[PDB]
Amino acid sequence: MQFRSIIRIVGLLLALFSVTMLAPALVAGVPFVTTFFVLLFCGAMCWFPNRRHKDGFLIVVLFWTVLGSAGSLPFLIPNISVTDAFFESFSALTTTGATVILPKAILFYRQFLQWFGGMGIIVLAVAILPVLIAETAKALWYIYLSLTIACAVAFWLAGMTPFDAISHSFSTIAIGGFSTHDASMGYFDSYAINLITVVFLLISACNFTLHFAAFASGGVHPKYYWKDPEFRAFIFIQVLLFLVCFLLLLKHHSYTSPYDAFDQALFQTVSISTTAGFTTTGFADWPLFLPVLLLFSSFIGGCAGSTGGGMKVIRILLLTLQGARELKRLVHPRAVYTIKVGGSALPQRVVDAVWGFFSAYALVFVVCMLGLIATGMDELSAFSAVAATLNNLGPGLGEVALHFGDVNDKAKWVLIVSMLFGRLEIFTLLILLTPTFW
């Protein structure tokens, strides 16, 4: 099936991935250079005997097929077992805080991996239009420059030397919840960093596709204040979050001073809630239900045209508000229902497809919970772990045993696939399984 074209294109892809492998070498390192050489060699052998050129789902799978391989070689010789080495590689990879447990070059590379993951996750994410020319690089390069320079200067304000500010900035690009120390923000708590970082968390997560027009000099920004459905819904949930935090604070009478109670409390609620992953609280001053509630909050993750693939506003919104239309259906079946919350008329093909996706998603959820518990994992610690795993924050808080090294490595391989599913569209592998497809 035209294998000659596929070999050269795939080889070029592996070589291109390999070019971006000199990151630790800047910090005087050799295995990563070796990976570039081996894959480049692969590209070279693929490239020359075959010259001819010319499905798509196969390509997407091959895309993230690649991303998965690679990044596992320098760890078998960090002395850790091969399954654990692979698991750790994925742990560093995909911005998942999968801690079971370093060199200063490797650590820089790990934060760099977060950088690579962050840019990579949002580039083919709005490039699915042919299945459902490279000029977007510049406009993306400008927005990024604004994001990183702003973060670095913001860290600088505290007074740390630029290397430290840059180090923290690299750590927070694709937040997995990692920092210099295991405590996410407990080890260093300058007030300016906390306030500024929380602002970064709010601004950086929900929406950048909407502001793509910002590249054009039309000045369409003040229009978005009004009639933006996302803004009203999102503000209602977040403001409600603030009010409940305030109420909880008053009920327990935790901190009398405003600054610690508001910044620290707000920081914990926002950080855990926003799927950030920076957690430094054992939730003892909070009741037990707050960890459970927060975990449910963790499920709500990502925004439309955002870094994280999770349940979105429009999907839940459609179910609820469309659900309201269904409530109206319950009142009367003779009654035509057509309501358009959005400015456009909405076609009935997409809505049905979306909730169907949710139903299949539920099936996957059952598979993940049942499978992980089924493999030999404990009912509760794994239960919290699966909730956390699907979201991609970290270890399960309830009945804490954060580091699972002694769990079965084949299941660990399953954990890798599950977290990968957490980031990538889950049903790509699903298309592979079906018997009608063969």
Next chain:
Amino acid sequence: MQFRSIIRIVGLLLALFSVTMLAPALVALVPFVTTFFVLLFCGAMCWFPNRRHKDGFLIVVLFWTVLGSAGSLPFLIANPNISVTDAFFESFSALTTTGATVIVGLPKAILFYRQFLQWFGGMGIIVLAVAILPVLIAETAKALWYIYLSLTIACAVAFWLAGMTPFDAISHSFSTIAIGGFSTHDASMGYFDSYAINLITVVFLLISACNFTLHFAAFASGGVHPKYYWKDPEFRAFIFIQVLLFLVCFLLLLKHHSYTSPYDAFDQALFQTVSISTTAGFTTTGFADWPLFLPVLLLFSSFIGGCAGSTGGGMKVIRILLLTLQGARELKRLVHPRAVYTIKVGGSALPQRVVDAVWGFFSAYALVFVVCMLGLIATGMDELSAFSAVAATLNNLGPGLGEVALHFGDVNDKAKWVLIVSMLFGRLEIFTLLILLTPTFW
């Protein structure tokens, strides 16, 4: 809003409910008689001053509302001496047909009435199940009577074969009419374990629980009965799921190598799997010879509950079937959105009208599920025991097996009231009280 016409009909309804309140009075060795008199008095004061006569959802809510109005009065006063909230909870436990035990301990007359309550609940739930056509003449009362006579007589004679005196056979029969999971002793079959009863009862369980409205044609005399073998999908899907259940039981038996003899292992093992699975509620196993996942798996099995036209209202074959098969259509939609999908699993062409409602019902159901889990844990209940309890509660079997502490006398009584409403919600369509909360409705 024409209140004079609601007063007489509702009063008549209360009096009618009261008419069948003489059940313990047959067993000498008064409060229930008092309930009949008080409600009859209520009907009387609502019948003579008003002579006039004349929405519908209010009436259905009201019918369900009537249950439990006079099901809790005789328990505050007297052998059952228990607190008022607990008395109400206990009343609902017996009445709801759920197995909500707070006590260990099972008056002969009161107990007879309790089993009788199971009889009342069993016929009552089925009768109004198909009477919802005006919103979505009483000639059915004899055709259901023949079928019911067949069911009760068959159960009694079946128990009689074992060799117990007819009173004991009838007692067990009354106990198994609507299946709470109760017997003379707390263990379902541990106290008496005769083999004929076990085999016959399992047959009873399989036949009784699915689907009897298909066999409503059994009353008019015709030959339609052989045709159903190839006629219905329900048989292929249901048989496939049950057979798979048998195979997994067989394979888990051979993996652990539990019992070498085939009589005990197949009947006891099969009995346990089917009984826990079929929303029956008869449980005598602590699941130690089974791994821990089997209790979890069984609880998931408990969620699958009811057949279309069956006594219990729980997720069904057609709903899940629609999601998966229609889901398959959805699966085929990722391949080409340009591709028209129209498929009819059933004999008729199926309309796109009802189908959105089914999954919408599931979505709303999930919302309710979140409310129940979050609310019960939120009230002050424990993490895990409550979690198993809510799964079990929605189904209406009994206690959560995992980390078992079935009896919860010391749990908060207002939440216990919430538990009562939750289990009732399991039995009746949850939404029937959801149309009250909406502000657009007022």
